[PDB]
Design a protein around this ligand. Structure first.
Ligand SMILES: NC(=O)c1ccccc1Nc1ccnc(Nc2cccc(O)c2)n1
Lengths: 10, 357
């Protein structure tokens, strides 16, 4: 399992 | 001089020209906080203006620890201190302290207004939990966690914020148990009992829940209705807990209606949780289980920080370096119960703010 790298903040 | 000024509302910032083109982004309590571009740095930064650095014997104690702690505590999950200064020339003139920190895209409220998937929500929660831990490893409690004090970045990293109310152990039930933000006060705080490390863990619950439901968990029309919203939810705490309450509080608490409470399956029906996969650790079941171990009225029974970092929903991200990091070290200068004079303080704020840049 790998760590998330993106996060939509709109 | 070197500094300058800009009209930021009914106030004014006097900063080093290295920080250019300001704009407000936060109407907090320790002061307004502007987002600006540090030319020398070539990275946009955050600046906090400290309101009346020593107005009341109280605003000092906090504005101080903020500084101190801002300094003595460094962790990848805790807003890094970039700079501090003061447009004033000398003591007799001194009366304003500016704080420059890294700068994140947004506040957790932002996440709460969007759907996450396990991976995300679990990673964030993880990060959040690492930040706290590091603090706790020094007996340092935050006392005031909430969306408002948590920030994210386009790359999905979490960073803790604010240390005004930050303090240690917890001699008793403080003086003004109002200072902590309502919706997130933990039973020990509401019923004025005296907090332990895990008091933060409760706030963490209120947060995750909010992140799940998209609305505040335990609302509350006032300082007292708060307790009501809590029990109507988890149900009246058991006698063992009552017995731990002060004699006056005890009475009142027992005179309330007897609420049973609702099962977490109904407080957070599987749907509300990010769509489950097939994976076991990252499952609504597990996520829901953490909650139940944090949203506990009797603190003595509320999952400690580590226990959280080890729980199956946050476990998949564990890494010694981040979790088991080395304890930060505060000199012994900073006290959370000490008491000086408006002036006596004014000095320690300089002789600190000074040797800081
Ligand atoms: N006391 C503070 O440090 C404070 C109070 C209120 C609001 C922010 C902040 N601080 C802060 C620090 C770094 N990055 C952001 N990023 C950010 C961006 C957009 C909206 C936000 O709410 C925050 N905000």
């Amino acid at each position: 399992p790998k760590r998330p790298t993106t996060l939509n903040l709109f | 001089n070197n500094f300058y000024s800009v009209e930021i509302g009914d106030s004014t910032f006097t900063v080093l020209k290295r920080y250019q083109n300001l704009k407000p982004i936060g109407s907090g309590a320790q002061g307004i906080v502007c987002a600006a571009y540090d030319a020398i740095l070539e990275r946009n930064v955050a600046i906090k203006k400290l309101s009346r650095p020593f107005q009341n014997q109280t605003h000092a104690k906090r504005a101080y620890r903020e500084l101190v702690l801002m300094k003595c505590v460094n962790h990848k999950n805790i807003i890094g201190l970039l700079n501090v200064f003061t447009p004033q020339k000398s003591l007799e003139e001194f009366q304003d302290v500016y704080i420059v920190m890294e700068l994140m895209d947004a506040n957790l409220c932002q996440v709460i207004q969007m759907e996450l998937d396990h991976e995300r929500m679990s990673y964030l929660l993880y990060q959040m939990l690492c930040g706290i831990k590091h603090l706790h490893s020094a007996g340092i409690i935050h006392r005031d966690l909430k969306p408002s004090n948590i920030v994210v970045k386009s790359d999905c990293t979490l960073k803790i914020l604010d240390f005004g109310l930050a303090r240690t152990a917890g001699t008793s039930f403080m003086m003004e148990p109002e200072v902590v933000t309502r919706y997130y006060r933990a039973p020990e705080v509401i019923l004025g009992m005296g907090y332990k490390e895990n008091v933060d863990l409760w706030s963490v619950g209120c947060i995750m829940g909010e992140m799940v439901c998209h609305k505040i968990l335990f609302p509350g029309r006032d300082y007292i209705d708060q307790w009501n919203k809590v029990i109507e939810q988890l149900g009246t705490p058991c006698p063992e807990f009552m017995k731990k309450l002060q004699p006056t509080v005890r009475t009142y608490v027992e005179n309330r209606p007897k609420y049973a409470g609702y099962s977490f399956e109904k407080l957070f029906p599987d749907v509300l949780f990010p769509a489950d996969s097939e994976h076991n650790k990252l499952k609504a079941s597990q996520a829901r289980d953490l909650l139940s171990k944090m949203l506990v009225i009797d603190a003595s029974k509320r999952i400690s920080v580590d226990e959280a970092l080890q729980h199956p929903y946050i476990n998949v991200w564990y890494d010694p370096s981040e979790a088991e990091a080395p304890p930060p070290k505060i000199p012994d200068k900073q006290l959370d119960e000490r008491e000086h004079t408006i002036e006596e303080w004014k000095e320690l704020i300089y002789k600190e703010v000074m040797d800081l840049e």
